Symmetry: C3
Subunit: 224 residues, 3 copies
């Protein structure tokens, strides 16, 4: 009955709870960046735009690669408003109370695990979306699923440019971090599953690969 459990796991509604955890962890990483708090005070619109890049950068990159509107996902008003509320509560909550609650390690590890549920589902969705437009475009499937999982990391050089920072000596492609490298393995596995060369159901691959990302990210977050 594992496939019955994996089907319910791979079909959980990501909105709004799982997307909220994705937004919280992403905007928390934004606040950790240098000058982010100062930027939210002096340039609040640029700070909000930076948070939208962290929350929706995966959709922006996928739409750019597929020749679609890079802000197509911003038509989902509920998701944009929810991400805006997360950005406001993390940077402007009185007593910084929202930051204190989500940074609590037992609460943070749960949001980190819920973010990996959204990431793996986003990788598979990128492969399936590209396959619908190119039935045999294996390199397009792998590229689309890769940026859907890496997200804002692949546009870090220009996320820094929006903040007024320019460090061209490195990029996430020249030196991949763990989520970027893991999303590359993920988009290859989901592409092979699309080719029917990887004999496994799509729900089982979502379940097993999400648990791999959950165990890795929770261990990496709790260690540091």
């Amino acid at each position: 009955q594992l496939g019955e459990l994996a089907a319910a796991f791979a079909s959980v509604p990501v909105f709004p709870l799982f997307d909220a955890a994705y937004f919280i962890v992403s905007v928390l990483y934004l606040k950790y960046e240098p000058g982010a708090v100062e930027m939210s005070r002096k340039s609040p619109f640029a700070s909000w735009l930076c948070a939208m890049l962290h929350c929706f950068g995966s959709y922006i990159l996928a739409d750019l690669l597929l020749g679609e509107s890079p802000i197509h996902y911003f038509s989902n008003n509920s998701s944009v408003i929810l991400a805006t509320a997360v950005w406001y509560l993390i940077f402007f909550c009185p007593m910084n109370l929202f930051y204190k609650c989500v940074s609590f390690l037992p609460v943070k590890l749960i949001f980190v695990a819920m973010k990996e549920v959204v990431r793996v589902r986003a990788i598979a969705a990128g492969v399936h979306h590209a396959h619908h437009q190119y039935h045999h475009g294996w390199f397009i499937m792998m590229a689309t699923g890769w940026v859907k999982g890496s997200g804002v990391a692949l546009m870090s050089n220009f996320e820094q440019l929006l903040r007024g920072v320019w460090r061209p000596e490195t990029n996430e492609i020249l030196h991949m971090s763990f989520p970027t490298k893991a999303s590359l393995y993920g988009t290859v596995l989901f592409t092979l599953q699309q080719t029917h060369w990887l004999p496994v159901s799509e729900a089982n691959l979502v379940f097993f690969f999400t648990m791999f990302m959950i165990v890795c990210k929770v261990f990496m977050t709790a260690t540091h």
Copy 2:
């Protein structure tokens, strides 16, 4: 009978007279930039391409955001040729006579006022165009109308890159100028008018907001 006057005001043909004033003021600002005259002598094609960015950057940004061809507007041959003639007359007219005529303050203030007529119409057109593709995409309407009014300012970091200049410590989003900040207020007003939440006709909003931009820009130009 104000709505009768506002209807005639909001429907004036921008081509070619009002677009010419838009091109003249934009290329004049290009010539004010450092090394622009030297660039027109040593790299004339790059100088012409820079002038097209100042004349058509609003259309380039809007088409990029909506996933359309960024040079789609360059199919309008009459507008491209007219902008090319303005660029040639400003940089290469014998005795620099064309520059002397358009830089005359009474003539320059008229071209500045006529440019604001094109800008406000461009903001409203960006909101209406985005609404046609997304009936409830409020954030897409606001983004499209914003870049239609700001124009080349939002791509200043890469307009400088084309000229061989790189100043990443600032950008028009991190520190907005007046036209960029005013276009943000304008695209919100025209979006609210599209939502039918702002109880005012589209022609009255075009008339009142253009006069606001005309008064501000003419006062800012005559002061300095």
Copy 3:
């Protein structure tokens, strides 16, 4: 019977032999770049991505200008695999034997001449493709044919950025090289031929302009 010869010349199958020569010369130029060999050892994926930019940058730029998927051409699996094999054989062949064979001057000059056959055909294809979408878009035809011939040269500033290099003081538009400047003349000639204002058959223009590029590039390669 020249038009009979020019028709057979302008219709030779570029795949796979002529495209292979295009890939070999392009990846050879990549290996000549600073730090390229070191990059292939420490960042092999970024090195492969760099080689795809040299092999397919003309298609990436044309699809970007026309608002199509910038990786649309990567659906051609045979071409991507062939370019990947060329990249692997140039950087990782035992004894560096593949590099030694293709760098042999009599063999290199043949691959250089075969690359110009692909470039001129790519320029004409860009003009014809843009004309199909814009029957009278002369500036769109010229821009599309230009990037189809220049290729990765017009994106050199960002090909360097992928490698961790940033030299913004110059670009291929501010200071054109010979292939970039020749592709600009080529796309104007093929556009004029599309307008029916240049009284010459499309096959004769392909034949005469390819021989011009072959003579120039072979002379430039053998001299240095």
